[PDB]
Amino acid sequence: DIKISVVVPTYNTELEGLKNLMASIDKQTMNPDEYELVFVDDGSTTDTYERLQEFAETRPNMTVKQIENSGWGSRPRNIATKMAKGEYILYLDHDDTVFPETFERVYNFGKENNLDVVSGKEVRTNGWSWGWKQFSENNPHAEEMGIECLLPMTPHKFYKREFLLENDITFDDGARVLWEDVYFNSKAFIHGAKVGILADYPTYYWIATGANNSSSFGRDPHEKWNQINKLFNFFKDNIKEQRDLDFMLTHWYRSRVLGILGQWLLKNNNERIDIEFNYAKKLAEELIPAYISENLDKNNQVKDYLLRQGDLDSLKKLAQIDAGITALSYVEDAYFKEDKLFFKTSTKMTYEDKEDFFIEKTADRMERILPEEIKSKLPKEFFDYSDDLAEFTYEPSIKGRNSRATWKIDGSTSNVEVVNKKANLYKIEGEMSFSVQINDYILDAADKKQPWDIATRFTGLGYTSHRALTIGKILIKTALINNKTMIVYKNASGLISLDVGSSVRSIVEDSGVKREQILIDKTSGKVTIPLNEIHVFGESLIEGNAELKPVGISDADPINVKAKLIGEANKARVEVLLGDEKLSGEYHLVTNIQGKKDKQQIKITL
Amino acid sequence: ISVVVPTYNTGLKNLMASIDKQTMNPDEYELVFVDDYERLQEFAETRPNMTVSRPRNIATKMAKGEYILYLDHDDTVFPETFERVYNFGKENNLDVVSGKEVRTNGWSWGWKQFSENNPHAEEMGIECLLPMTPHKFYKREFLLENDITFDDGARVLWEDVYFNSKAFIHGAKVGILADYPTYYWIATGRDPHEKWNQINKLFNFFKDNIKEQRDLDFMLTHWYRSRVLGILGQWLLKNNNERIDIEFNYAKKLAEELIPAYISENLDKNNQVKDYLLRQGDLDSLKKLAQIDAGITALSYVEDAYFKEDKLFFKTSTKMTYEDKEDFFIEKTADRMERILPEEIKSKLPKEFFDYSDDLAEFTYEPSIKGRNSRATWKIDGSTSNVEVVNKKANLYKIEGEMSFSVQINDYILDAADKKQPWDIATRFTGLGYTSHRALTIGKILIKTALINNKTMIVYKNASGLISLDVGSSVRSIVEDSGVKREQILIDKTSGKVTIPLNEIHVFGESLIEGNAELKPVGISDADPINVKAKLIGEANKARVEVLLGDEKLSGEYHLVTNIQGKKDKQQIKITL
Ligand SMILES: [Cl-]
Numbered sequence A: 001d002i003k004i005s006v007v008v009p010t011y012n013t014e015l016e017g018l019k020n021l022m023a024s025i026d027k028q029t030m031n032p033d034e035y036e037l038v039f040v041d042d043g044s045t046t047d048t049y050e051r052l053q054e055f056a057e058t059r060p061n062m063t064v065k066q067i068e069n070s071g072w073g074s075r076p077r078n079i080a081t082k083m084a085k086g087e088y089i090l091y092l093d094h095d096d097t098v099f100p101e102t103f104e105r106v107y108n109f110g111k112e113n114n115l116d117v118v119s120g121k122e123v124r125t126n127g128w129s130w131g132w133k134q135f136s137e138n139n140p141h142a143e144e145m146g147i148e149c150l151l152p153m154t155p156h157k158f159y160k161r162e163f164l165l166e167n168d169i170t171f172d173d174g175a176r177v178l179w180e181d182v183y184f185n186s187k188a189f190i191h192g193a194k195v196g197i198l199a200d201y202p203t204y205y206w207i208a209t210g211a212n213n214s215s216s217f218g219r220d221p222h223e224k225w226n227q228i229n230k231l232f233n234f235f236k237d238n239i240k241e242q243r244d245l246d247f248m249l250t251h252w253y254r255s256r257v258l259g260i261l262g263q264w265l266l267k268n269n270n271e272r273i274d275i276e277f278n279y280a281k282k283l284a285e286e287l288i289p290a291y292i293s294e295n296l297d298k299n300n301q302v303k304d305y306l307l308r309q310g311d312l313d314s315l316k317k318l319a320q321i322d323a324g325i326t327a328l329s330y331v332e333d334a335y336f337k338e339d340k341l342f343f344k345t346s347t348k349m350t351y352e353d354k355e356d357f358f359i360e361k362t363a364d365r366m367e368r369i370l371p372e373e374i375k376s377k378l379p380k381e382f383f384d385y386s387d388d389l390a391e392f393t394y395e396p397s398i399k400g401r402n403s404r405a406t407w408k409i410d411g412s413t414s415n416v417e418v419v420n421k422k423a424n425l426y427k428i429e430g431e432m433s434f435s436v437q438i439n440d441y442i443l444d445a446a447d448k449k450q451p452w453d454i455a456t457r458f459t460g461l462g463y464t465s466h467r468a469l470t471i472g473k474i475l476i477k478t479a480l481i482n483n484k485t486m487i488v489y490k491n492a493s494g495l496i497s498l499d500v501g502s503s504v505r506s507i508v509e510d511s512g513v514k515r516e517q518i519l520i521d522k523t524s525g526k527v528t529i530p531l532n533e534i535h536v537f538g539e540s541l542i543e544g545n546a547e548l549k550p551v552g553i554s555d556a557d558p559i560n561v562k563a564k565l566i567g568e569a570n571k572a573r574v575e576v577l578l579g580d581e582k583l584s585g586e587y588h589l590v591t592n593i594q595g596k597k598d599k600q601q602i603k604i605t606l
Numbered sequence B: 001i002s003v004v005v006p007t008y009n010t011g012l013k014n015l016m017a018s019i020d021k022q023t024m025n026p027d028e029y030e031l032v033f034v035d036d037y038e039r040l041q042e043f044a045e046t047r048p049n050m051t052v053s054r055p056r057n058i059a060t061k062m063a064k065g066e067y068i069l070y071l072d073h074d075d076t077v078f079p080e081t082f083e084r085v086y087n088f089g090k091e092n093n094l095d096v097v098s099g100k101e102v103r104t105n106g107w108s109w110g111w112k113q114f115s116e117n118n119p120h121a122e123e124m125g126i127e128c129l130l131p132m133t134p135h136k137f138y139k140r141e142f143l144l145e146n147d148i149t150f151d152d153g154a155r156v157l158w159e160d161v162y163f164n165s166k167a168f169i170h171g172a173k174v175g176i177l178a179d180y181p182t183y184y185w186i187a188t189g190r191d192p193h194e195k196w197n198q199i200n201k202l203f204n205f206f207k208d209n210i211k212e213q214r215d216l217d218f219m220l221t222h223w224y225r226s227r228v229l230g231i232l233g234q235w236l237l238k239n240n241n242e243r244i245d246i247e248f249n250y251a252k253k254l255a256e257e258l259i260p261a262y263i264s265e266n267l268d269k270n271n272q273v274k275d276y277l278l279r280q281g282d283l284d285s286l287k288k289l290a291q292i293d294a295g296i297t298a299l300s301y302v303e304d305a306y307f308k309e310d311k312l313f314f315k316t317s318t319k320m321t322y323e324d325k326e327d328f329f330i331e332k333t334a335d336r337m338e339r340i341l342p343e344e345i346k347s348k349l350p351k352e353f354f355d356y357s358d359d360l361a362e363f364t365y366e367p368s369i370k371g372r373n374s375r376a377t378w379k380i381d382g383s384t385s386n387v388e389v390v391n392k393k394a395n396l397y398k399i400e401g402e403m404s405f406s407v408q409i410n411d412y413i414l415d416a417a418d419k420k421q422p423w424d425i426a427t428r429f430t431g432l433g434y435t436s437h438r439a440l441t442i443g444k445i446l447i448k449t450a451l452i453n454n455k456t457m458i459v460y461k462n463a464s465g466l467i468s469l470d471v472g473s474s475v476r477s478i479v480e481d482s483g484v485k486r487e488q489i490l491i492d493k494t495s496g497k498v499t500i501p502l503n504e505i506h507v508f509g510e511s512l513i514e515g516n517a518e519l520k521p522v523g524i525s526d527a528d529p530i531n532v533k534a535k536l537i538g539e540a541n542k543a544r545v546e547v548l549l550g551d552e553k554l555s556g557e558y559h560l561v562t563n564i565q566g567k568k569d570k571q572q573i574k575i576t577l
Helices: A015-026 A048-056 A074-083 A102-113 A161-166 A180-189 A221-238 A242-260 A270-287 A290-295 A298-309 A312-322 A507-511 B012-019 B038-046 B054-062 B081-090 B140-146 B159-169 B192-209 B213-231 B241-257 B261-266 B269-280 B283-293 B343-347 B478-482
Strands: A004-010 A035-041 A062-066 A088-091 A117-124 A158-160 A195-206 A325-337 A340-351 A359-362 A365-367 A393-400 A406-408 A413-422 A425-436 A450-460 A463-468 A476-481 A485-490 A496-500 A519-521 A526-530 A535-537 A540-550 A559-567 A572-577 A586-593 A602-605 B002-006 B030-034 B067-070 B096-103 B137-139 B174-185 B296-308 B311-322 B330-333 B336-339 B364-371 B383-393 B396-407 B421-431 B434-439 B447-452 B455-461 B467-471 B497-501 B506-508 B511-521 B530-539 B542-548 B557-564 B573-576
Touching: A004 A048, A004 A074, A004 A102, A015 A048, A035 A048, A035 A074, A048 A062, A062 A074, A074 A161, A088 A102, A088 A161, A102 A117, A102 A158, A102 A195, A117 A180, A158 A161, A180 A221, A221 A242, A221 A270, A242 A270, A242 A290, A242 A298, A270 A298, A270 A312, A290 A298, A298 A312, A325 A425, A325 A450, A325 A463, A325 A476, A325 A485, A325 A535, A340 A393, A340 A450, A393 A413, A393 A425, A425 A450, A476 A507, A476 A540, A476 A559, A485 A507, A507 A586, A526 A586, A540 A572, A559 A586, A572 A586, B002 B054, B012 B038, B030 B054, B054 B140, B067 B081, B067 B140, B081 B096, B081 B137, B081 B174, B137 B140, B140 B159, B159 B192, B159 B213, B192 B213, B192 B241, B213 B241, B213 B261, B213 B269, B241 B269, B241 B283, B261 B269, B269 B283, B283 B343, B296 B396, B296 B421, B296 B434, B296 B447, B296 B455, B296 B506, B311 B364, B311 B421, B364 B383, B364 B396, B396 B421, B447 B478, B455 B478, B455 B511, B478 B557, B497 B557, B506 B530, B530 B557, B542 B557
Parallel strands: A004 A035, A004 A088, A035 A062, A117 A195, A476 A535, B002 B030, B002 B067, B096 B174, B447 B506
Antiparallel strands: A088 A158, A117 A158, A325 A340, A340 A425, A359 A365, A359 A425, A393 A406, A393 A450, A413 A425, A450 A463, A450 A496, A476 A485, A485 A496, A519 A526, A526 A572, A540 A559, A540 A586, A559 A572, A586 A602, B067 B137, B096 B137, B296 B311, B311 B396, B330 B336, B330 B396, B364 B421, B383 B396, B421 B434, B421 B467, B447 B455, B455 B467, B497 B542, B511 B530, B511 B557, B530 B542, B557 B573
């Protein structure tokens, strides 16, 4: 009967903070009697549980319960899981929202493929990607790729309820644990769960809400490595498939242990460094097998080797040398063609978007430029980039400013070259061409009117640069394509944006008007205002209005009339319908297409 | 010397506390006040040399000094200027002298004129008085004999241009004193109709009072480009259409009525385009041109930086870009180098106005410095640069430049406070009518120390990504940034020489900077912190710190925190004595 159960823990949660959440559930296309809401309050000390209980009385599919306070959301999640009746369970946190077609699409995907876990595409407020690797294409048999299919391991997936009960998969109830959701998803996979990835529709919006946690638990350096030790022991004791154990070992050794040996060494005091360095050296010796480092890139093998040697001074010097390496992309050309937007971009590896990043060519080896002092202490292959010069990636991406959803722009062609600038020094240059088909990223009705931000992702030599596309010159190009206003522009921050639906810019203002080509039809009451610079493809009819005020009347009253933006035969124009309005004299015309007024100083004599 | 002081809602104690710090004999300079206050009388009775537009013209005859200056509110005057300006004007018999002026912001002030001293600077023309600030030194004889006077009456813009031009028109002898920084201007016409009524009054003053044709065409060219054509560039992108239409029609009316046609012959290509379209009334083309010209600059990166002998050396590279991003390009059509423009604008213009062919050899590329405490700017002499026009793709050409220069910090030290202050490096690139004077930047971390003739110098990439040079530990600790080879620490328990050598540093000459240290017990959170004497030595291409414990009374392992010139270290020096 019930397809989905929504599990939402609360604690001193005001009803106003649930307004956006409850609104996103009401907007679900799935019938309300086919899902249920299970709120479990963690023993609120204030009077917020009373207001929530009264709120649920008007909603039959919503049940609320309070337990004794546990100081954590794991026990509320478990209590609600055993209360739930639905076939699938979504763990929805009260600060987050869901997209309107999530329940319909996810359940159909899971039921038609008999999935135990549907890892749906998740969206975050910040960043240019989330789940870039896994949220690529739909995969009903995702567990065949190994335990990696569940990354990123947030709890915001849809888990089959009976599968959790049969395997007794719960959240840790006792002491608080870091990366608790990693334990939960890993336990689900090692019990043979069928995993499906739904990547073609954003399902969950994980919202950043000024996380000034102010918790000594999350800042205690000894607690941190106590939690890291038990996380790795959990891997080694429970994950028995060699392929999946080795992946989790390398992934978390790279991110959490090796991740303090880079920029982190430049923004921490010396005593904090000594404490966490000795913790990391001991953990690598005790829990990280030596073969794991063979799966790491060159720069991480150097960090691994120097860590096990206890050479903190060399790692500090290397952190200073690597600081600032990036790859910013510049727009070399941008234009509309037919029904798409085209880009030509260029990039190169630099230090802070300044001087070039170099690599030396000694003998037949492309080597990392390092001091002779540090270089004479490392294995010679670890600073040899020769085998890695053919594995650069250069791709475009897009991000909706309202939905915060992120997509890879397919169909691009790129090329990365290793060029000799001078002597034996080599830079890394990249070129790319791609087109944007905005229909590929419009899924919900609200997506049709949205500013879009364009980014570039450049990887190579172990570095990853996912940054916004930028330009120096002023760029303003307009287009009217199949009932969609489109403008590519250098925004106020100096980055490239695409405003569709006149949510930022007026297309009449940015295109300009053929001033001496305005036609006034007296017998028809139609005023034609042709647009100057604009790319028009297909038929378009966009309705707005126009305000008329007589010239020279300081306090003149607005004469609101109807207007239309018409795209027809590769030409755009605004038709101001005057009808039978009694008018005479000179007037000011101000178009208002899609809630955006122009500043073209249009005057008209009638 | 007589100093004038105009009270305008009068800071008053501050101005007297700065003027009394001069080197010249106090009974050799006079101070004149005008208030036509009850606390003014009390400041005059305390000490002798203090008498108590319209307020400044009465004070001109009221004074009895050979040379007189016009000191404004909140403005500073450097210590040695009084005597240096008097001896320079007397031995050269100057009617007016323009000492080196200093502003808070920017990387230069009077770049062209204030480069070299010239006591016979009136030979070149009226340009020698630029920039025409009221902050020069004037002789009472030439002012009273020629009746040169701030135009009393309603507030007039560029009265400094009136007061400085009227002096030169009446045959004034002026010397440029770029040897030493003198006046410090702290600073701190809004209506569009007031603005252009004043601009009309300025140009009418030129052709009515300036008789020398060379001095007339200069002022006519210099101010038509800055104030009239100056609103046709970025200004068109920062104002509303109403303001633009009112101001553009004023600018068009002044060009037609006052500015002759032959003035455009002395302008560069881009300004000739602005003059042509202005007289045509084509505001649409100028607005489009402002969008195309926006963001054009040239940023310089550090290719290499090192100490050699007793100088700091740099090797920089630059390239004309749009806002430090993609490259600025010029087109090669037929045999001429054209600027990239649409066909709608290129067809509306004379073909010569967008041809950079005869200008590709006029590029400049020079260095600069600035004392962060003094805000004084200088040009680094003895530099080698080269600009190249390089084909990148198809017929598109970019402007690339490379440059090498060295720095001697004793050249820019003039006051006792100049010995210890941060220094900021900058580059100046000029070409095709554009001028980019930006700070020297670097992306990678740069930290290099040196010990040269008791000067402790460090070149470092600052928090803003720019190049800075700390001299005297005003910002950084040379011990921390040089490193410490703790394995080579020596201990002479007999006399007490606790030797601490430094790792990476460029030592030159002999140096002997003194300081102290602070010792603490190991791990014991708190205890009596007793400080001991310490000393920093630089001998024979090596630097070392020698701690002094002549009265030894410690036992166990101890923390050593050096402290040279008020800058401790983070080297974690644990000593065991
Ligand atoms: Cl924007």
